[PDB]
Structures are given as structure tokens and as C-alpha cells.
Enzyme design. Sequence first.
Site, PDB file in Angstrom:
ATOM      1  CG  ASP C  45       9.252  -7.276 -14.385  1.00  0.00           C
ATOM      2  OD1 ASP C  45       9.046  -6.862 -13.225  1.00  0.00           O
ATOM      3  OD2 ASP C  45       9.818  -8.362 -14.629  1.00  0.00           O
ATOM      4  CB  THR C  78      11.038  -8.327  -6.980  1.00  0.00           C
ATOM      5  OG1 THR C  78      12.363  -7.791  -7.075  1.00  0.00           O
ATOM      6  CG2 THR C  78      10.292  -8.102  -8.290  1.00  0.00           C
ATOM      7  CB  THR C  79       8.483  -3.578  -7.717  1.00  0.00           C
ATOM      8  OG1 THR C  79       7.168  -3.996  -7.332  1.00  0.00           O
ATOM      9  CG2 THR C  79       8.807  -4.144  -9.087  1.00  0.00           C
ATOM     10  CG  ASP C 352       2.119 -15.701  -8.078  1.00  0.00           C
ATOM     11  OD1 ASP C 352       2.271 -15.922  -6.858  1.00  0.00           O
ATOM     12  OD2 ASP C 352       1.740 -14.595  -8.519  1.00  0.00           O
TER      13      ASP C 352
HETATM   14  N1  LIG Z   1      -6.626  -4.031  -8.093  1.00  0.00           N
HETATM   15  C1  LIG Z   1      -5.691  -3.554  -7.237  1.00  0.00           C
HETATM   16  N2  LIG Z   1      -5.970  -2.539  -6.390  1.00  0.00           N
HETATM   17  C2  LIG Z   1      -5.050  -2.059  -5.535  1.00  0.00           C
HETATM   18  N3  LIG Z   1      -3.797  -2.531  -5.449  1.00  0.00           N
HETATM   19  C3  LIG Z   1      -3.382  -3.548  -6.239  1.00  0.00           C
HETATM   20  C4  LIG Z   1      -4.329  -4.128  -7.199  1.00  0.00           C
HETATM   21  N4  LIG Z   1      -3.670  -5.103  -7.846  1.00  0.00           N
HETATM   22  C5  LIG Z   1      -2.410  -5.146  -7.345  1.00  0.00           C
HETATM   23  N5  LIG Z   1      -2.241  -4.218  -6.387  1.00  0.00           N
HETATM   24  C6  LIG Z   1      -0.996  -3.969  -5.620  1.00  0.00           C
HETATM   25  O1  LIG Z   1       0.151  -4.441  -6.332  1.00  0.00           O
HETATM   26  C7  LIG Z   1       1.111  -4.940  -5.400  1.00  0.00           C
HETATM   27  C8  LIG Z   1       1.864  -6.135  -5.966  1.00  0.00           C
HETATM   28  O2  LIG Z   1       2.719  -5.757  -7.041  1.00  0.00           O
HETATM   29  P1  LIG Z   1       4.138  -6.501  -7.159  1.00  0.00           P
HETATM   30  O3  LIG Z   1       4.029  -7.791  -6.386  1.00  0.00           O
HETATM   31  O4  LIG Z   1       5.226  -5.518  -6.811  1.00  0.00           O
HETATM   32  O5  LIG Z   1       4.258  -6.882  -8.713  1.00  0.00           O
HETATM   33  P2  LIG Z   1       5.643  -7.486  -9.258  1.00  0.00           P
HETATM   34  O6  LIG Z   1       6.209  -8.223  -8.069  1.00  0.00           O
HETATM   35  O7  LIG Z   1       5.226  -8.382 -10.399  1.00  0.00           O
HETATM   36  O8  LIG Z   1       6.427  -6.269  -9.673  1.00  0.00           O
HETATM   37  C9  LIG Z   1       0.337  -5.339  -4.154  1.00  0.00           C
HETATM   38  O9  LIG Z   1       0.976  -4.814  -2.988  1.00  0.00           O
HETATM   39  C10 LIG Z   1      -1.039  -4.728  -4.306  1.00  0.00           C
HETATM   40  O10 LIG Z   1      -1.294  -3.823  -3.229  1.00  0.00           O
END
Ligand SMILES: Nc1ncnc2c1ncn2[C@@H]1O[C@H](COP(=O)(O)OP(=O)(O)O)[C@@H](O)[C@H]1O
Lengths: 494, 104, 485
Positions: C45, C78-79, C352
Site C-alpha cells: 500500500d 489515493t495512489t 468502500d
Molecule cells: N483487473 C484489473 N485490470 C485493470 N486495471 C485494474 C484492475 N483492477 C484494478 N485496476 C486499476 O487499479 C486502479 C485502482 O487502484 P487504487 O484505487 O489506486 O488502489 P488504492 O487506492 O487502494 O491504492 C484503477 O484505476 C483500475 O484501473
Amino acid sequence: TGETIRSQNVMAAASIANIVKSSLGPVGLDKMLVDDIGDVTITNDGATILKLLEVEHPAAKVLCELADLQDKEVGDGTTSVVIIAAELLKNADELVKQKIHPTSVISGYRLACKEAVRYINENLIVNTDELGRDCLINAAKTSMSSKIIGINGDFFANMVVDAVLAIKYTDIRGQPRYPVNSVNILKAHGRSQMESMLISGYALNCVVGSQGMPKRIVNAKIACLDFSLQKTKRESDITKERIQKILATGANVILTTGGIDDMCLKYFVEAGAMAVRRVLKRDLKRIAKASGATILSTLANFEAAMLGQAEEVVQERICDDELILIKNTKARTSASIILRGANDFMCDEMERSLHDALCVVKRVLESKSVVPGGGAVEAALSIYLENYATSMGSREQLAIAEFARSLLVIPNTLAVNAAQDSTDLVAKLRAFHNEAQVNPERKNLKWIGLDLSNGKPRDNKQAGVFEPTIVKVKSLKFATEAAITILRIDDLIK
Amino acid sequence: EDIEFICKTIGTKPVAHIDQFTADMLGSAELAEEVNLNGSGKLLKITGCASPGKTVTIVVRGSNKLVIEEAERSIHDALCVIRCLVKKRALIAGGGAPEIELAL
Amino acid sequence: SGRKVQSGNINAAKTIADIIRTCLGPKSMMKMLLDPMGGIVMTNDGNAILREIQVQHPAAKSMIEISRTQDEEVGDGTTSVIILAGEMLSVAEHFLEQQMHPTVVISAYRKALDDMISTLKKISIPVDISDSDMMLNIINSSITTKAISRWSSLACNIALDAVKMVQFEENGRKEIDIKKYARVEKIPGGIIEDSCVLRGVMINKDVTHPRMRRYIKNPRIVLLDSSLEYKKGIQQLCEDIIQLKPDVVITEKGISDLAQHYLMRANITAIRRVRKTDNNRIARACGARIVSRPEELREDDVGTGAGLLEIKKIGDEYFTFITDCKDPKACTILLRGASKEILSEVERNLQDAMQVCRNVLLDPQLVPGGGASEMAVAHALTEKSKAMTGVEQWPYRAVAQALEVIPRTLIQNCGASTIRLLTSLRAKHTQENCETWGVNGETGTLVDMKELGIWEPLAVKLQTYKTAVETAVLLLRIDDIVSGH
Ligand SMILES: Nc1ncnc2c1ncn2[C@@H]1O[C@H](COP(=O)(O)OP(=O)(O)O)[C@@H](O)[C@H]1O
Ligand SMILES: Nc1ncnc2c1ncn2[C@@H]1O[C@H](COP(=O)(O)OP(=O)(O)O)[C@@H](O)[C@H]1O
């Protein structure tokens, strides 16, 4: 190392100005005020900058406390006085390195300040009359510009000016003193923002207390009470005795802040009183002073004529709601402005814009003597003083001339802060004000302001950007006094 | 160190114990109010006294501590000149005239 | 001096953003945290990475603050927010060197943000709420790739039962919703399947002697912060209660047995040692009011609260099962299991999905993720920029250019070349009319987004874009930092 404390003090002045130089103007860049504990703040106005700016050099302390003095005196202008003072200090230091004894400089600066204030009190603008509305509505529109309401912003700018004229409340000295809280905010739903309109009285959105209360009441005596009207187990149960007793005194229209009552229907039909809860405290105090009454908690036993007045209370369908249109009070203070659309979250910026337009209009209404803003005053002063230096003729010609040249740094910093070419814009301003004096027929060319929307020279009296005369006069006086005090200090060597 | 001056000015007799503490044991004043000047310093203004015997006060202000000291020095210089007028009754023209005259 | 502080600020922003640039998506590259004590930390994370790391530059501190706020506001992304802000500042670096004022740049950014807000709603696909089939499809799509893969059934049923138990109809139609007034009851014991949902508030505090009619057919809860004493010689509270005749009274301190009998005479059930963090939801579920001034006491002091109270003892714990209360606004969701090691993250993902449902009520829109939405909005901005005139058009194009960083990182952290895939995605996306293709995150292969079946709520993506743009303008509006260190 340093070679003269004059140089060190003017370097301190240049630094303290350059820190706050950029933030001047509504388009000024914010400043990042870090502290030891790391609790950083962001601000764009020089007063908030200098109140918490960590100063180290004594000249900087003197300049910042003069700035605080000016802020406590008149408010706006701290950035301008600091910048003008620093410019005067550096120009006078150059001129003293030009082998001029500083006391002649001080005398010339004082004479120049006297001539400048006399000029300003002679070539100001007296447009702050009842005849001045096009300039005022134009100022409201320009301050209101760059929004989605610009289609209907004309009607808002037209209603705000005559509303604040109407809601204007005179003081004990016979002068207009508008209370800002008198104009109360008001939400609306359904129709979009283009259907908003001016209301001459506060309209609270609440439940219908009763239906026997007419629109217009000849005699109204507001026996406002905080407690609710309910039966429990001068009266043990506050439902009948005090209400009827004050009805005998003459309380016809009673604005009961307390809750509703089951048998209050007949009493409201026979008397004409209302029971409204969830009243905003500032609005309640304003309607108390608008109706000329105080807040009564209980009625345990004054009641003769102190009770408030609600002459006309329209009970109709306003914005598909039964708003209590309590208006025509004894003192013309209670009024509100509707805000249509869907709700307040998106139009909150519209609400703040209306508030700031109200504020600028009411500040223009006060200080009846006014001058054009946007650097026109500075250019006119420079043109006057350039001729006055040669006319006066003593050895303070250079002092007065450099005072005149130093006054044109405010247009320079406004121009550079507006992303426009500073020197070009100030030169255009200077050339426009040359015709104000050289040509005697071009009398009505003295208010070429700076339209920051495009950064182009523009008539400003029509535009409406205004500055109180007292503000500029005191600002110039304080800047000159600070310059004199700093220039009078050289008793060190570093 | 200011206790003696305050007692001399506002006519307050010193109080060391609660045994003999009374109102007339102190010195009354007409008005005693605190004001704020520029919001950076609170100065108490005990304005007016029943018997302000041989005492005045001026809130000497200025750009800095040191120019404030300069104003104080000017005030004391004026006071001392008045005292010299009182003690010695003999007046001369100034403005550099006596120096050049006596040099000649 | 001057613009140098701006360059330093944006350099700090870029060097803090790219630290966790590579840790988003289904194949995030993992990172090292080495404290100066010899320890070694396993973390994926990026939010955790930035929380653990400490930095001195104030601009980076403000960006940490905005990241934390976005984490605590809408949920994930957030990332993505940090990456977008860093890329936008890095691309604005070139324009800052171009000797143009930050004012024109930030105006161009504002106009670009306004355009993006509209074009997002233009391309967002509609969604339905409470439709079990494709809501469960969304659950298998986005609510997955967490630790609920083998246990998605419990999360899905919990979310679907508890979507309609914190809705607030204040100014509209259930569009106001909170994830805190819900009664989450996380206690170990039994199997994980023991978790359930109840329409009411549960209290972990109970009287020491529940040998009494704790439940009434219509409890009338009234909050009281005072503690009853033996008598006046205070007993007066007992007669004050008797005046209005309620049946349940809440206090934060214990009640003596003699005082308990006095309250039995007062016809009220005394509840002791309650907690404010539970008393607030008690008042929310029961609509209680607190008042002690004798003059202000009226018929409105006591109002109807619960509808069917009961107390059980599960797992030797003094439970308190209030159910079927007046307002289904603060209800109960039970959380049981053998161990709590994952169920906390389970309930985080539950909240969420709760935000997902709340914004679906706000705007029933889903955006094609996996770079599809990003490429769509970038294409919209680039095509709209053709008509734009003046110097401000270059930032209006550079913001679009820098927004494609998300698919770039997705392709980069899977082995596939980040250049050929991006070029193919852009070239085919333009000629495509309404396709919105999105790159697969696992294989790093182009695929039409409907077939893959991944989507995000419109509100969360909108908030991410807005926060990124506002951070960019805030960090570009700083002219100097000198106030000490
Ligand atoms: N199976 C998948 N295929 C392509 N992209 C994905 C997939 N699962 C998640 N993503 C990408 O991950 C992103 C979300 O990650 P994020 O919200 O930054 O995680 P966190 O907020 O927990 O760090 C989305 O923009 C999405 O495009
Ligand atoms: N609409 C406007 N157009 C051009 N100049 C303006 C406008 N509004 C204010 N100004 C300028 O702002 C200056 C004063 O602002 P400033 O002194 O920075 O406020 P403060 O003293 O609160 O910091 C004035 O000289 C005026 O010319």
C-alpha cells in the site's frame, strides 16, 4: 560586511518588501508561511503575512509595526504602504549616495506628501451620490464577473445597489451606517438561479403556524418568547395566561420563537400571532432590532410599546413555500435575498460572491469622498509632483522628484502581478494622465484604472473600482512618516 | 523599585499586612481603564486622580524602542532646560551666535 | 529566488509521487521500508508507505495531508491522486521555465478541469442499484482483488443488506448516507457465517442484574448525563421522570439496587455505564432528547424510541439487542468469526462498497477503468483543444497528456512495453467512436472494457481528478516559502 547602515537598512526594507511584493492585488500569489512546529498557513493579503512573519532586523521591525499601525488605523493598504516605503528608502539611499544630506531629503518628502494630499483632496471624485448608479452597478457586475450567472448578473447588480440603499440604516450622528448582517441569506429550490428576485423583508422557511393571520396588520406588537406553548403537569403551564395577559396590553402579532400548540389555533385567529421554531440566532437578533424590541425569555410578573413591529407579513405561496414575510418593521433593517437553483452546495460560491458584492457596494457608499482605484491616483500624483518639484525650486527638487518616481511602483506591481508587462502598462498609464494636465480640455481623463481581467488601460470611474479617500490619504501619510523615520536613522556602522 | 514612585504619585500608603488594611490606607483615582494601542501592546490608563501631586505621564511612542528613548531624552532635555531657567536667571541668544561671537 | 522556490516545490512533489508510482493495480510491484534499526518491512500500500516514511519539505507534507484526506473521504484511488498530481506538476515545470506567469497556467488548468468534469459524465455508463445480478458482478469486479476472494459471499450479502440502514432523507431521496452510524459488532467467536444484520442498535454494556422487564413494547429513550443517587437527603430526578412517565432511561454511571427499585417505581429501566460513542447512535436510532431545566420541561422531552427490545447472552457477553426501533437510520450489522485478522479489512471493503452504493444513488454512473476512462478524457481534451486559441492552450493539452500516466504505469508494471501498448491504445481509441477500450491489468493486453468488466463509481473518480487539479493549482500558486526555516 556592509559599508553604511543606510545600505543595510534599505536592504532590509527591500527584502521585507520583496517578500510581500507579489501578494498585492486580487490576483496575487499566495505565500507559504512555515513555522518551527511545521503548522504552515497559506494567505494572500499582506496584513496576515506581516502579523506572523518572523522578523529579525530592527529596520524590518520598524517597517512591519508601521504596517500594523496603518492596518489598525484604516485596514486595507498595508501592502501598498510597505512597498511605497521600501521604494522611497531605496531611492533616497541612492540619492544620498548622490551626495545629498538626508535632512533636505526629509524636508522634500514632507513637502511632497503635503502637496500630494492637497492634490488628492482637490482632484478626487464625488460620484458617491444618489445620481451614481451606472458606475455602482458596473462595479458590482465587474466584481461579480467570471461566473455562470453573467447572463442574469445585471439584475442582481441592479437589485443589490438599491437594496443596500433602501436597507441603509442611519446612525446617531446622521450618517449612513449599513449593517452587513441586515441582509440575510435565503435558499430556494425549483427554479434555477436566473429566477431570483429582491425581497424587502426576511422570509424564513418553516411550518405553517396558523392560517388566521392576515397579510397586512395595522397594529403589531411582537411579544417574542423563547419558551414553547404546551400544557404540562405567572402560569405553571405556558399556554394561555401570559399570552392573553400581553394581548390585553396590546400584543397583536406575537412572533413566538417557541413550539406550536394544539389550542393556539383559536388564539392566533382572534389575535394574529405566529409560532416559528428553528430561527437563526443572528436573524432573530436582527429582527429584534429591526422591530425595535429585545429578546424576552419568560413573562413572569416594558409591555407598553417596546414590543416589536411586523406591519405586513405576507402569508402566500412564495417559491412553493409558506415563508413568513415579516417586513415593514419599525426600523428598516430586516430583509433577505433569495438564492434559487437546486440547493446551496453548488451556489455557495454564488452566495459568497453576493456577499462580497454587498460588502464592496456598502464600503463605496460610506466614505462619500472617493478616488478612482487601479493606479490612477498614483499616476496623477506622479504627474503633479514632477512639475511641482521644478516649480518649488529649492534644493529638495531631487527629493520630490524621487518621491514622485517612487509612487509609480504600485501600478508596476499590480501590472506584473496580473501577468502583463509591467513597464509597458505603467508607461501607458503615465501617458494617459499626461493629457489630464497638459491638455486643459481633457479634464475627464483622470480615472484610467487597470482592468485586471485583460490587463488593459480602462476608464475606472465607469468601471467602479473605488478606494476611500481617507484610506489613500492615511496610507500616503504613514508611508512618508515611515520613510522619514527610517532615513533619520543612521547611528551605526555596518 | 516603582513602589515608592507609585505611592508618591497616587498617594497610596504601603500595605505589608492584612491587619491594618483599609481603603483610605490606599490612594484613590478618578478612572482606571486598560486600552489597546494597535493591538500589539496593552497599556493601563489610570486617568485622573484625587491628588496627583507633582506628576505627569506621557505615553512616549515611536517607530522602535530606541527612537522612543530619543523622545524621552528630548522630553528630559526640555525639563532640564526649564530647571536651568529656574535656577539661573540669565538669557542669551543661541543658534550658534554665542559660539562664533565668543570665538571672535 | 522567485520561480526557484516553485521549481523546488514541484521537484519535491515529483520525487515524492514517483516513489509509489509503481504500486497500483492488480500486479503492484512491492516496496522496501528499512528503518534505521535493522528491521525490514513488507508493504504494498503506497498510502502505508507514505504514512511510514517521513519527509521535511512542506509541500510534500501538504500532499501527504491531501492524500490522507482523500483516503478518509471517498476511499481508494489515493495512489492515483498522488500520481496525477506529480505528473501534472512535472509537466507544468516546462511551462514555468517558459517565462509565463503561474496565473495563466492555473487558469488553463481550471478550464481543463471544468472540461474533464463534463466529459466524464459524457462517457460514464449507467448502472442500477439493488439489482442483484450486475451489482454482484461489480462485487466480483472491484470489491474483489482484496482478501475477500474466497469469502466474497459474506461481504456481498452484508453490503446489500446494510445499504438501506443508514440512509438519510434530509434534503432529497436517501442521497445522504454515512458509514459511521451503522452498528458494526466485531466480536470473535463461532464461524464467520454467524454475522447477520439487525434493525436496531446493540449495546455491549448491560445491567449487572437483568432480572427485570428490560424490554417494553414501546421504549421511550431519553438521554441523561446525570447519575442517580440514593435520595435527596438525587431522588428528585425520580419524580421528574415520573411526571412524563417514560420506560427507558440512559445514564453513563451505575445505579444502586435501592436506586434501581426507586426507578422501578418510576416505571423506567435504568441502563448504566453506556458510552458516548454508543450513546450517539442510541440517540440516532431512538430519536431521544436530553433536557434537565424544570422550566423548559414539556411534553416534547420524552419521545418514542425502540419498538421491540430484547437482551441475550452470546459468548458469555452481556449483549443488548434493540431491534425494530422507530428509525431505521442507525441499525445493526453483526460481525462474527473465528479470528479478526481479515474481517477488519473485510469491513473496510464493505464501507468502500457502501460509498459505491451511496454515489450510485447520487449518480448511477460507472466509468470504464483500466485506462479506458483516462484515455477517453485525454482524447476529448486533445480534440477540444484544436479550437482553443492563445498561449493557454498548451497547458490545456499538457494536462491531458500527463493524465495518461495511469495506463502507462499499469502497462509498465506487468512486463509489457510501456510505449507500444500506449501507442496502440491511443491510436485505436481515437478512430473508435464509442468503444473506450481498457488495458487488462494482469496480462497487460489490450481488451474491450465491457468484456473485461471492470468499473469505478463516477463520484470517486471525479473526486480524484478534482483533488489532483486543486493540488496542482495550490502548489503552483505558491510564490515563496521563506518564513523561517
Ligand atoms: N483487473 C484489473 N485490470 C485493470 N486495471 C485494474 C484492475 N483492477 C484494478 N485496476 C486499476 O487499479 C486502479 C485502482 O487502484 P487504487 O484505487 O489506486 O488502489 P488504492 O487506492 O487502494 O491504492 C484503477 O484505476 C483500475 O484501473
Ligand atoms: N478590481 C480591481 N482592479 C484593480 N485593482 C484593484 C481591484 N480591487 C482592488 N484593487 C487594488 O488593490 C489595492 C489594495 O489591495 P491590498 O492593499 O493588497 O489589500 P490589503 O491591504 O487588505 O492587503 C488597491 O491599490 C487597488 O488599486
